[PDB]
C-alpha cells in the first residue's frame, strides 16, 4: 500500500491537543508496492 512518512474519502478530524502530538514533521519518503 502507498505510504508517506515525514515524522523523522474524508480521512478523519484531529481536534484535541492529545491527538495532535506526533503530527508535526521531524524528510518525506514515498513508498509504492503491489
Amino acid at each position: 500500500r502507498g505510504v508517506a512518512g515525514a515524522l523523522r474519502d474524508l480521512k478523519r478530524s484531529v481536534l484535541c491537543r492529545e491527538s495532535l502530538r506526533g503530527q508535526a514533521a521531524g524528510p518525506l519518503v514515498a513508498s509504492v508496492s503491489l
Binding site: 500500500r1 502507498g2 474519502d9 474524508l10 480521512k11 478523519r12 478530524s13 484531529v14 481536534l15 484535541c16 492529545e18 491527538s19 509504492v32 508496492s33 503491489l34
Partner: protein, 446 residues
C-alpha cells in the same frame, strides 16, 4: 544455505514462568540491544456492564498521568529521559501497557510498569481533565467511517450482549463515571492470575523473573474473593444496520458471519481462504493482473477504492468477513463479486490458489514477528488466549495441512447458507436488501 523449514527451528523457545500469585512471566531472548516489555491484562469492554462501559478506556487515559510514588510528570520524565517509549491499547478483550527501551534499562522499565498497574493515582482533578479529552476523541472517531462501520457491525452482530459495546463507551457514561467506578474496575480485573508480563529482545529470562518477584509480588493473587469474573457466550444475530448519509462522498460496508473463536483450529484454514480473496487499495500497482479475482475485477471495472477481508477473534466467537468502501453506484456490484467468491471457495476451490493463500500466510506471519514489540505482543496475547506460545514451526504444520478440500469444507461450515451481520454507512441507497444479501450466501446451481 539454511532452508525455510530449518529457519523455523532456529527461533528460540519462548520461556514461560509463573509466580506464586498467578502472574505469568514470558520472554523470548535475542541478541538485540533494545527490547520491549509490557503487561497484558485480560480485561476489556466485554467485561464491562452498561453502567460502567468505557471504564477501561478511561483508565488508559489515567495510567500514565501519575502514580503514588511518581506523581504527575515524574513518570513521563523518567521514560523520556532514558529515550524509552511508553504505549498502551485496549480492545474488547485485552488491555496492554508496554515500554520500548534499551536492554540495560530493563529493571527500570519493569519497575515503572509495576507502579503503573498497581499504584495508579486517579486524581479527581485529572479525571475531570480526561473527561473532556475522551469526549473530544469521541467526536474525532465519528469522522472515521471505518471506525464507525465496525462499531456498528459489533453493535448489530452481538446485539444484546457485552460484545456489542464499544471500547470507548457512550458519551453519557464518560460524563457520569466516578472515581469509585474506576477503582472498582481495577480491583476487580487487574488481578495477578489475569495478567502476563511479556518481554522480547536482549535479555535473559532469569532477570525478568527476578524483577517479576521484586516488583509484582505485592499484588493479591490466586484467591481474591467470591467475585470471580467469567465470560459467558455472546449470541450472534444475523441483522442489518444502515446509516444513510448522502453528504459523505463514499459508502462504507462491513459484512460478516460468525467465527469460531481464538482456540478453534479452523482459524488457520479460514485465514488461508481470506488470503486468497486478499485485499485491495487504489494505490496498488498490480491492478488487472492481480491473482485475487475480486481484486482484479475491482481494479479493472473500478468497483471500489479499497476492500479488506478479516477474521476477528473473540472468546468462542468472532466476526469473519470483509469490509470495503466504494462509490454509491458500485455497492451492488461489489457485494455481488464478494459473495460470489465466498460461494466459489465453498464449492469449487482449487489446489493452486490454496497454495497461494498458504504462502501469503507464511509471509504474513514471519513479516509480522519482526521487531521486539510485535513479538512481545504475540507473547502477551497468546498466553491470555492460547495459554501458551504457539511456535512458528507449529503454525507451519497447521498451514501445510490445509488443502483445497479443507478450504471447501471449512468455508462451507461458516459461510454457506448463513445469516450475515451487515453494517452500512454513507450513501448506501444502492446497498442490497438483507434478503438479497442472504440469498447471496448460497448458490442454486450447487
Amino acid at each position: 544455505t539454511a532452508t525455510y523449514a530449518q529457519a523455523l527451528q532456529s527461533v528460540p523457545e519462548t520461556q514461560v514462568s509463573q509466580l506464586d500469585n498467578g502472574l505469568r512471566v514470558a520472554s523470548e531472548q535475542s541478541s538485540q540491544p533494545t527490547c520491549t516489555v509490557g503487561v497484558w491484562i485480560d480485561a476489556g469492554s466485554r467485561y464491562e456492564s452498561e453502567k460502567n462501559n468505557g471504564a477501561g478506556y478511561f483508565v488508559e487515559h489515567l495510567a500514565f498521568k501519575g502514580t503514588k510514588n511518581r506523581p504527575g510528570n515524574a513518570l513521563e520524565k523518567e521514560v523520556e529521559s532514558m529515550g524509552a517509549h511508553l504505549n498502551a491499547y485496549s480492545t474488547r478483550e485485552h488491555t496492554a501497557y508496554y515500554i520500548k527501551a534499551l536492554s540495560k534499562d530493563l529493571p527500570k522499565a519493569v519497575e515503572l510498569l509495576a507502579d503503573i498497574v498497581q499504584n495508579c493515582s486517579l486524581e479527581d482533578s485529572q479525571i475531570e481533565k480526561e473527561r473532556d479529552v475522551i469526549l473530544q476523541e469521541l467526536q474525532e472517531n465519528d469522522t472515521s467511517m471505518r471506525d464507525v462501520v465496525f462499531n456498528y457491525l459489533h453493535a448489530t452482530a452481538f446485539q444484546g450482549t457485552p460484545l456489542a459495546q464499544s471500547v470507548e463507551g457512550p458519551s453519557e457514561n464518560v460524563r457520569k463515571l466516578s472515581r469509585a467506578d474506576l477503582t472498582e474496575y481495577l480491583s476487580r480485573h487487574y488481578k495477578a492470575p489475569r495478567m502476563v508480563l511479556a518481554a522480547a529482545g536482549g535479555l535473559e529470562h532469569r532477570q525478568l523473573l527476578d524483577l517479576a518477584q521484586k516488583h509484582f509480588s505485592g499484588l493479591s493473587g490466586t484467591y481474591d474473593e467470591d467475585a470471580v469474573p467469567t465470560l459467558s457466550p455472546c449470541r450472534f444475530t444475523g441483522s442489518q444496520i444502515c446509516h444513510r448519509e448522502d453528504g459523505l462522498p463514499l459508502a462504507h460496508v462491513a459484512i460478516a458471519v460468525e467465527g469460531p473463536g481464538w482456540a478453534h483450529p479452523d482459524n488457520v484454514a479460514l485465514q488461508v481462504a481470506n488470503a486468497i480473496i486478499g485485499h485491495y487499495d487504489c494505490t496498488y500497482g498490480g491492478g488487472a493482473h492481480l491473482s485475487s479475482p475480486l481484486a482484479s475485477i475491482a481494479a479493472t471495472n473500478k468497483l471500489c477504492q479499497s476492500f479488506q477481508t478479516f477474521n476477528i477473534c473473540y472468546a468462542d466467537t468472532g466476526l469473519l468477513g470483509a469490509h470495503f468502501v466504494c462509490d454509491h453506484m458500485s455497492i451492488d456490484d461489489m457485494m455481488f463479486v464478494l459473495q460470489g467468491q465466498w460461494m466459489r471457495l465453498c464449492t469449487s476451490a482449487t489446489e493452486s490458489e490454496v497454495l497461494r493463500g498458504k504462502n501469503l500466510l507464511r509471509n504474513a506471519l514471519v513479516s509480522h514477528l519482526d521487531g521486539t514489540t510485535p513479538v512481545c505482543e504475540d507473547i502477551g496475547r497468546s498466553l491470555l488466549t492460547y495459554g501458551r506460545r504457539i511456535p512458528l514451526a507449529e503454525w507451519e504444520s497447521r498451514i501445510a495441512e490445509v488443502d483445497a478440500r479443507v478450504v471447501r469444507e471449512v468455508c462451507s461450515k461458516y459461510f454457506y447458507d448463513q445469516c450475515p451481520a451487515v453494517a452500512g454507512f454513507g450513501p448506501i441507497e444502492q446497498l442490497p436488501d438483507y434478503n438479497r444479501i442472504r440469498s447471496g450466501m448460497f448458490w442454486l446451481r450447487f
